[PDB]
Paper text:
Oxidation of Met to methionine sulphoxide (Met-SO) damages the proteins and can alter protein function. However, these damaged proteins can be reversed by the repair enzymes, methionine sulphoxide reductases (Msr). Two distinct Msr enzymes have been classified for the reduction of Met-SO: MsrA reduces the S-form of Met-SO and MsrB reduces the R-form. However, enzymatic studies demonstrate that both the enzymes share a common catalytic mechanism based on sulphenic acid chemistry involving two (or three) cysteine residues.
In this study, we report the first crystal structure of MsrAB from S. pneumoniae (SpMsrAB). The monomeric structure of SpMsrAB has the overall dimensions of approximately 74.5 × 37.5 × 39.7 Å3 and consists of two major domains, MsrA (residues 1–158) and MsrB (residues 172–312), and a linker domain (residues 159–171). The linker, iloop, of SpMsrAB consists of 13 residues (residues 159–171) and, interestingly, contains one 310-helix and several hydrogen bonds to both the MsrA and MsrB domains that could restrict the positions of both domains. The asymmetric unit contains four molecules that show two conformations. Molecule A (Mol A) and molecule C (Mol C) are the same conformation (conformation 1) while molecule B (Mol B) and molecule D (Mol D) are the other conformation (conformation 2). Interestingly, Mol A contains an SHMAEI hexa-peptide and Mol B and Mol C have an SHMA peptide in their MsrB domains, but there appears no peptide bound in Mol D. This structure results from the crystal packing. Interestingly, as mentioned, our SpMsrAB structure reveals a complex between the active pocket of SpMsrB and the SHMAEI hexa-peptide, and is the first report of the structure of an MsrB complex with the product Met. The structure of the SpMsrB complex indicates that the catalytic Cys-284 faces the sulphur atom of the Met residue. We compared these two conformations and found that SpMsrA occurs in two dramatically distinct conformations relative to the centre of the iloop, while SpMsrB forms a complex with Met. Kinetic analysis revealed that the apparent Km value of SpMsrAB for Met-R-SO is 20-fold lower than that for Met-S-SO and the catalytic efficiency (kcat/Km) for the R-form is sevenfold higher than that for the S-form.
Author numbering:
A (entry chain D), B (entry chain C): 0 to 312
C (entry chain B), D (entry chain A): 1 to 312
E (entry chain F), F (entry chain G): -1 to 2
G (entry chain E): -1 to 4
Write the structure that this text describes.
Amino acid sequence: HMAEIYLAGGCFWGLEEYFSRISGVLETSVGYANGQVETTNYQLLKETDHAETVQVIYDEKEVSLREILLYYFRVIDPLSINQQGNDRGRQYRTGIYYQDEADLPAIYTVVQEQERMLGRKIAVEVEQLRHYILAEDYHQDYLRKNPSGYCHIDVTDADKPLIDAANYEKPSQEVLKASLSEESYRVTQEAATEAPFTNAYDQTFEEGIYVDITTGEPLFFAKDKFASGCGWPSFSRPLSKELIHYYKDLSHGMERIEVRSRSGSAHLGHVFTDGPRELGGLRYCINSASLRFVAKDEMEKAGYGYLLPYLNK
Amino acid sequence: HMAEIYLAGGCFWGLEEYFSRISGVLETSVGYANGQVETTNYQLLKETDHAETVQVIYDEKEVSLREILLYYFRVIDPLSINQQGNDRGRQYRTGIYYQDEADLPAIYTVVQEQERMLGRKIAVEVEQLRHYILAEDYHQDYLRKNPSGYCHIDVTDADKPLIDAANYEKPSQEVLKASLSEESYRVTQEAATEAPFTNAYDQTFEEGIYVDITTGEPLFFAKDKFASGCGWPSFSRPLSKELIHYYKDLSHGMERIEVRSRSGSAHLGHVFTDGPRELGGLRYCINSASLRFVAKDEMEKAGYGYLLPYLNK
Amino acid sequence: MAEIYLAGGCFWGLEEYFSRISGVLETSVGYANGQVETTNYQLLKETDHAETVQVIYDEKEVSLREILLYYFRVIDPLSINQQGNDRGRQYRTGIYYQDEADLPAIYTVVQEQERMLGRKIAVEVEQLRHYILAEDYHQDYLRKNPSGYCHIDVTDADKPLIDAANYEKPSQEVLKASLSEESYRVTQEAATEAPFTNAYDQTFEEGIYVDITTGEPLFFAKDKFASGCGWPSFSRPLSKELIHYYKDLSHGMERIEVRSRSGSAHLGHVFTDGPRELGGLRYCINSASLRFVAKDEMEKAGYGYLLPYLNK
Amino acid sequence: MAEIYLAGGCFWGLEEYFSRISGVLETSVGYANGQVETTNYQLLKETDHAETVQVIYDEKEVSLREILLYYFRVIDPLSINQQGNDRGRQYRTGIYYQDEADLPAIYTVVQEQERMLGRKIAVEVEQLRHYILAEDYHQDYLRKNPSGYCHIDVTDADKPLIDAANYEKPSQEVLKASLSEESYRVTQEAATEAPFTNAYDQTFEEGIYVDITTGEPLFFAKDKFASGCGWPSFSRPLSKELIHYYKDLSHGMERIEVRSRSGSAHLGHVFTDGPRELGGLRYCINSASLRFVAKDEMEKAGYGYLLPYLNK
Amino acid sequence: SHMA
Amino acid sequence: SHMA
Amino acid sequence: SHMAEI
């Protein structure tokens, strides 16, 4: 089974190329949608109130609408009004246009989730697709004609893993108080710190991924774990998604940046700016007690199979 | 009894037409307010700095100042500076001009709720009405005399129901504990599910509305309820108002979309995409235990008079 | 063989407007002063070019200064990268020259603009680096689709152009010695002549009324109407820039005082009790601040260029 | 050795720029006034620091006022979280100080910088809370990575700085006492000196010509040419803003008058009949409105800073 | 007597 | 049972 | 007499 969804997110040259590179998408195009007249072109665009839109035909079996949407919100400014990058105007307004009216429940779930996490309603408009005028030929697959053409978005983000927080809801407090080891609870829920070198993964360096012991949400890649002499597991960056981390200002006799997990809000440790400069210079110092290692082999059955393709960059 | 308020929100033609349709509005007129002198007309407007304003005389016992303001905020751009639609300039600035200082706390409380929701400060200005200068007759009731006249806003929104959440505050948790039946409480506050066909409204199809049993907030019209064999009452859409439902992803062995009420965040049930294709295709499968049915003939006495005549499609 | 390149927002309206100005021989639209040798309406948004209009004119028929005045009449001079509803660097304002001999004229108009506005303008002035003709579907766009996208009153190109430079206000002293005590007290002070005994209260003859102080045209006879309020009354001035408005709280009343542009002479007040079909405004002017010039003596004087406008 | 911190977009270009200004002893780049004292290029977006350039200078060679002027010369006074393509809070514009003793110099520049544009500037001014040195590959990024990204023209650091504040106009009383009768008539009353009998008509010695009424630099001896018109003639002023242009219709002619910037001294007129190779312009200036300062006496005269630009 |  |  | 160009 296959479906279609229309996404407006600024200049469509970068937006289409981005979606063409997504697993599950099988056909993309660009056009003008929801203007004030039934027809337009690139010249009358600024006069017809049409929004540059990218049509995305995908296979529900390979990629869900929800997923397409998550990929959409990671490439657009959700609060910007009539502007993305350096393009200003209504033709660059953000919009999610649906054909099938059964798409609403999923669209609304994603929209409200974005808002709940931003505290404020987003600027992205969601409405019925009134009409979609296919853009001229020079616009279609533009970047796939001009490999180095203009582009304000990093299309190589479409090839980055996307972890859906919904798949890892934070267990109940009580259930945690009972499922977590006294050590793991104190560190994760009270911001305690495990001993320096006696922790479980300080010297662990096997293929695989490190996960949030409190939720199961993926946090770091074994390939980003580097040898540190501080005694605690250390990584150069969160699992190919900086959205997995929440930073907070901490004043415990010093001034440091505390790091917690997205879903679950588990205290993980602290991040410093003294890591390998060849890797970004960051040093995410994490308590083994907040993590749960998952070996590459026991990964698929563990339910983290989708990450197998990223394990070794 | 009578009351008035002066509103500036872009070209006054559209705005006047829009308010002439609001229930409770007795009379409207357009004019120029708060300029730098007490003299003007169309030709002098850009020189005097007045704002195109709409005078709204309403019966405060039928519609409230607060309600006129909510109506005003649904159709104007609250962030736009000196502009609404294509018309740009200071005569198009948004403003709320009052006369009785005792009306300020109600005005500003709407402004603050509006900002907390948008996440940013609104550009609408609120000050005392200094002077209001009736505009030339050809401008009065313009859109009535000249249909097909310039009109940015959709005067139609005037006829959509307005449900003010402030009327349906959520009681303390203990009051709900004491007020609901063990079942409504379990379902509503703990996300339980009532039995399949033994529930009160499954086969109910009488005229009227369905309200959130925890706050009294209107949720569904009888006209949107349909025949289903699933066991639980089913609707094709929330009470002609999308804002009334929160959508959350849910896993209980399966993958669903749960729905909750806006004001009380009560668990209502789930929404599926297998409803009648003619009504929109969705199925809001709702627990009876999370609702109170208010028959058409009991609505007035129950405090829901304003929802008549929205009962017919 | 004389030309100037102007950038003032979407070039469609700007070209239609200039093509309609007496003295312009030819026009064309293109992309100028970008960060790359070439571009097109496709890559425009990324090459940093500015939509520009090429104006070729007859130095003998219309001056570069006159062209710039018509230019500033139709653009928003303080706006940064935006004209009407079009936003972006390609809509930035600019005056692009080729010969340095044009600088004095340009700078003079630019500074006069900043003096009138009391602040620097956003219009940039720089040498033309390269002007790329636009795709044929743009050239003479409104000359093909008479009813197309256009956010400027293209007929302003036909309204009279009164240059304030031609009516420099005389020194305060040369004035006090050149005009009657009446004209001086009214014109240089907030003095107002007697209601019905002034010279132009009942006048209704073909011609124009000028600022007695500077000679700057103020009103057409066709816009004068019968009022019997006592002082000559007009429904409006020749051009809107010609009048400055001020809040007058004097004599226990609140009204709008009116003064002439060049010269800033007190003229009287404006009310909104004028003939509805004419705009509703009543410009109540003192005869003492005006000098009526009949149609006959118009050409002989220096107002012949206004003859074509006397007719309704 | 003094120090001030400037945030003006990508610090690569700003540092290269300041590294060229005379008087600057040391330069470095980092992140300032964020929400935590820990951060780096990767954590920047999270920590809210502003990209900042640390300027260590010899306040006796170049003053804080001067540094700030050079600063405003290269950034955008009104942009919000943006300089060039770079958008974001790390590119917000700002001036961070430590000694609130130099707050007065800072605000004077901002006030007058605001009088000029009219609108208030978006530049941020506040106490330097902390400054975190950026990674080493960011230090002197353009000196080691030429052809690297650079939105501004670092050559602007060479254009001479002519601070009008050093040349304000003396009261009318002192001008009467220090200007000859002719210099006063030409300068304050727009009079004109006789053709060939003036002081600098035939002068072609090395140096500069200054406004006689304020001392403000106006012309380089190298831009002077013989025209045989009778008055000193120059092809252009030291810099474009030193001249104000006015339409001049007096004496039955139509010309363009030119006046100095700071003092508003009538200097003469500019024409378009000069050496086509020099630009075509002829700034016909009255000798009586200028003060010639030779090369050898420029330094004591207080114009040592212009010696480097005398040469062609 | 003034304008009014 | 549950809704599906 | 006065400054005049050509």
